[PDB]
Amino acid sequence: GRYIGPVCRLCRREGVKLYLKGERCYSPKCAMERRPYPPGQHGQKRARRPSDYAVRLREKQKLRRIYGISERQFRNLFEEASKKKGVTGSVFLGLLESRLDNVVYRLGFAVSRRQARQLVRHGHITVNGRRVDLPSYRVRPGDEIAVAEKSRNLELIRQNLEAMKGRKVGPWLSLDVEGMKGKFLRLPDREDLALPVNEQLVIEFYSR
Amino acid sequence: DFEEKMILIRRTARMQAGGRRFRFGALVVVGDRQGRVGLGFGKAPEVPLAVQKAGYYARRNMVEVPLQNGTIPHEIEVEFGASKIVLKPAAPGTGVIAGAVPRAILELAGVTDILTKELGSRNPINIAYATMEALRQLRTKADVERLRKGE
Amino acid sequence: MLTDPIADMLTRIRNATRVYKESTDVPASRFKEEILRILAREGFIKGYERVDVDGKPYLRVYLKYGPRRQGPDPRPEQVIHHIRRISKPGRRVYVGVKEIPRVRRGLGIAILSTSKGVLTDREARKLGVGGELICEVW
Amino acid sequence: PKKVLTGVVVSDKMQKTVTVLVERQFPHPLYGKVIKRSKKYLAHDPEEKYKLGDVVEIIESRPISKRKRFRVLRLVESGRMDLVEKYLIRRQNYQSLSKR
Amino acid sequence: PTINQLVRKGREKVRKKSKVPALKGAPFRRGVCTVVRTVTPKKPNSALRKVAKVRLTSGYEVTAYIPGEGHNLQEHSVVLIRGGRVKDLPGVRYHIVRGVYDAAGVKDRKKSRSKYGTKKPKEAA
RNA sequence: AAACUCCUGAACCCGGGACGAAACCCCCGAGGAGGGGACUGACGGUACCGGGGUAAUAGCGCCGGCCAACUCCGUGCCAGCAGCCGCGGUAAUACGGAGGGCGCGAGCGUUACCCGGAUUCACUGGGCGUAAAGGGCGUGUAGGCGGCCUGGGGCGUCCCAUGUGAAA
RNA sequence: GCAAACCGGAUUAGAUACCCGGGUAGUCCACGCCCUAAACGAUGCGCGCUAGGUCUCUGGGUCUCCUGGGGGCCGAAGCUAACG
RNA sequence: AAGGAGGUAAAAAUGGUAAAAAA
């Protein structure tokens, strides 16, 4: 269940931080800035030689950590990547982000991934019409994902609206500050929206 | 500017009335990310000697590869004694899917997507050599012309 | 005696490539004339001819030798990489529409004799048939 | 599609009944190479128009009798012997294998 | 094997001779038991290690160990014949369980609860 | 991380609330084709929709190499571990315990059982000088398998067209 | 003549053995029966193909040598994990 | 002879020392 707890303890575990807890985990510390490097007793002993496979494994962890999910469903949908054709890992990253929770995230609706899951699961976020629960709900090229009727009347909703402006959308996430909506479009990739994890490594490790 | 991946060291030794004097070898693969590669097996008393030296035997003994579209042209079977490296180029979405020796040598090369197996003796030394000749023996349409044009 | 002269041709040919020797002698037969015809025409050997040695019409096959490579000794790259007897006198390996080889994941060359003739790989493909898959070469 | 077989008539041994030595080719659904094997069916010859060796064509018939299926129709070639001959030799050599 | 020999002969299948005649897919078999003994692993060790001669519901004895360190079993327990040797006790296979119809682990096992008994180190205080 | 600060709202009440069913039947036209008329809910006041609203179960295995995860006590070939190599003979990163970390997450491990790895019955894919392995040599039955020209046959073989290979 | 077993002698801690002295089966010939082996090149046979140098058994050719069959050696390319 | 080598020669009165274990 999304680990739950010392979250940006992984902000340091992977090595380099991530937009995780939101405002703070991006403020003068994702718990980083102050002292970024893996926790634990051995916190800073003298970094050993990560076996090649383990660099790979740590990448897998890395990616699924930023994406905010257990690696079970993650496994299944990586298989779905193998099946649904395309240069596997690319259209994988795509059909990973196409998931509704972080669609809601980068659409600038939720400040952080966890917060996103809450909002979406409570049907605060509607999708092209009906208030879809399920944080795991892939959309399609054209669908307009909005919020709830009681959301224009909600608070940190307007926080998100006002404090976000001056920030451009993931070139397919066509929002609305005018009505609190958001169209879905084309499939993004490694470069449409980038992140600090080498995909090839991830896939090679995974399917072994 | 290449990249200096190692891939095992050897803690050799010989005996004598005088104890047992060890030694070290340094299997080392140096490849330029995308273009060429080179293998070097160090061989000195104390380890790092043999490691740096190995980097240099590798850097002297190079060889490049028809690294086109991220892969290799045709596919080959190479054998070294009882060690056989099995190589087939791969359409994208594959990876350097291979052992340790191979992914070492070929990521140092620049091989992005590669279907590869390895039959017979899996002895890392001979295996590494075998990979090096997999590179050494790669032909293309152009190469084909050289021979198959006619002189 | 010989249980299969065709193979013996392909093999003597090997020997020629491995010794570098202008041309080699071979038993003259019609089928192998078709074969070495394909060999010549499909970018490979240097030629075939209806020659003769002591009362026996034979064939002189000149082998193509590439540019003098260097390093330590030339060993000018060999036009004939390697050949194999696909459909051996044990395995009557029959090939057709979906049964066609590839060789060298792209190029390569295999030749299969059928009712519609001694077609090259892509040739057998281009006419859309099949038959015994005789020999492969790179 | 009444299946018909072309085979070497073996042994006139019975009246109105002949044995027929059929033999079929086959591949090898594992090893490629071709093979061959003999099968003895029941030729129905109500007037001994067939005899030693003469290849005839036999027919998938009404159940003529007890395993006695497979009538005849078109006789083919006579003066065969040689074939039936070799088969016979093999038979005697079957009686050349004893653990008693 | 030159193809034709292959056509006639062919080549022989695998066959497995079983490493556990607890048998009939028995990963828990009846362990009623008898005796206790001591043994001593090929060479460089020492201890006792039980007997579990079991009888299962099938038959025979065997040498089933225990999860080591402090027993409980006197002569019954219905130790569920488990499985897996070790370079000692010329057998060891078909292990005792620590749960079963006796044994029930070691009180104070703040770790291998999954096996060595213990419900849960419930501190309470 | 905590306590706290705010936000939400697992659970759970009040309300409303199903689709799952139009025929046979009745009449108009003949009981024919066509039109209207009428009975039919187990599931369950559940799914579901509206309002309201409480911070509310986290565990199992690993942490000597294989293999991502180390320091500290006790124990001192005793107690033990163990899939293989081995780990304990009074400084154990292996045993128990404890801090911390790896992994997994309403799951975690164990044994069992099959296929893989295993190209370790090798048809793609193997071997027999000395590693397992050439018959003590002959002989020759059957079988296997065959040089070079010509044409006929078209049996294997390739192709062409359909029947079929139900559904799943 | 020899030579297991067998005996005596020497030997040694002991000597049922190696060494000495004697000695029977056997080792020999006819017929039969056994049918094993390091029965070893530790390499099944038959065929075609791939540098030569060199010693020699042999058959042909007036012959410093060409040529077909052999038993040795060295080494092309190759092949083996290595010796080879 | 300078060598490697293929066949035929010479050459030892005696004995038991265990072993858990270190780099």
From Swiss-Prot, chain A:
Binds 1 zinc ion per subunit. SUPFAM superfamilies: Alpha-L RNA-binding motif. Its cofactor is Zn(2+). GO terms for molecular function: rRNA binding; structural constituent of ribosome; zinc ion binding. Zn(2+) binds at C8, C11, C25, C30. Residues 99-161 form the S4 RNA-binding domain. One of its GO terms (cellular component) is small ribosomal subunit. Belongs to the universal ribosomal protein uS4 family. It comes from Thermus thermophilus (strain ATCC BAA-163 / DSM 7039 / HB27). A zinc finger (C4-type) spans 8-30. Part of the 30S ribosomal subunit. Contacts protein S5. The interaction surface between S4 and S5 is involved in control of translational fidelity. Pfam families: Ribosomal_S4, S4. GO terms for biological process: ribosomal small subunit biogenesis; translation. SMART domains: Ribosomal_S4 (SM01390), S4 (SM00363). One of the primary rRNA binding proteins, it binds directly to 16S rRNA where it helps nucleate assembly of the body and platform of the 30S subunit. This is Small ribosomal subunit protein uS4. Keywords: Metal-binding, Ribonucleoprotein, Ribosomal protein, RNA-binding, rRNA-binding, Zinc, Zinc-finger. The keyword DNA damage does not apply.
From Swiss-Prot, chain C:
SUPFAM superfamilies: Ribosomal protein S8. GO terms for biological process: translation. Keywords: Ribonucleoprotein, Ribosomal protein, RNA-binding, rRNA-binding. Coiled coil: none annotated. PROSITE patterns: RIBOSOMAL_S8. It holds the Pfam family Ribosomal_S8. GO terms for molecular function: rRNA binding; structural constituent of ribosome. Signal peptide: none annotated. GO terms for cellular component: ribonucleoprotein complex; ribosome. Part of the 30S ribosomal subunit. Contacts proteins S5 and S12. One of the primary rRNA binding proteins, it binds directly to 16S rRNA central domain where it helps coordinate assembly of the platform of the 30S subunit. PANTHER family: 40S RIBOSOMAL PROTEIN S15A (PTHR11758). Belongs to the universal ribosomal protein uS8 family. This is Small ribosomal subunit protein uS8. The lineage of its organism: Bacteria, Thermotogati, Deinococcota, Deinococci, Thermales.
From Swiss-Prot, chain D:
InterPro entries: NA-bd_OB-fold, Ribosomal_uS17, Ribosomal_uS17_bact/chlr, Ribosomal_uS17_CS. The keyword Ribosomal protein applies. GO terms for molecular function: rRNA binding; structural constituent of ribosome. Keywords: Ribonucleoprotein, Ribosomal protein, RNA-binding, rRNA-binding. Pfam families: Ribosomal_S17. One of its GO terms (biological process) is translation. It comes from the Bacteria. GO terms for cellular component: cytosolic small ribosomal subunit. One of the primary rRNA binding proteins, it binds specifically to the 5'-end of 16S ribosomal RNA. Part of the 30S ribosomal subunit. Belongs to the universal ribosomal protein uS17 family. This is Small ribosomal subunit protein uS17. It comes from Thermus thermophilus (strain ATCC BAA-163 / DSM 7039 / HB27).
From Swiss-Prot, chain E:
One of its GO terms (molecular function) is rRNA binding. Keywords: Methylation, Ribonucleoprotein, Ribosomal protein, RNA-binding, rRNA-binding, tRNA-binding. InterPro entries: NA-bd_OB-fold, Ribosomal_uS12, Ribosomal_uS12_bac. Residues 108-119 have a biased composition (Basic residues). PROSITE patterns: RIBOSOMAL_S12 (PS00055). The keyword Thylakoid does not apply. The keyword Zinc does not apply. The modification 3-methylthioaspartic acid is found at D88. Residues 105-125 are annotated as: Disordered. One of its GO terms (biological process) is translation. One of its GO terms (cellular component) is small ribosomal subunit. With S4 and S5 plays an important role in translational accuracy. Interacts with and stabilizes bases of the 16S rRNA that are involved in tRNA selection in the A site and with the mRNA backbone. Located at the interface of the 30S and 50S subunits, it traverses the body of the 30S subunit contacting proteins on the other side and probably holding the rRNA structure together. The combined cluster of proteins S8, S12 and S17 appears to hold together the shoulder and platform of the 30S subunit. NCBIfam families: rpsL_bact. Belongs to the universal ribosomal protein uS12 family. Part of the 30S ribosomal subunit. Contacts proteins S8 and S17. May interact with IF1 in the 30S initiation complex. This is Small ribosomal subunit protein uS12. It comes from Thermus thermophilus (strain ATCC BAA-163 / DSM 7039 / HB27). The gene is rpsL.
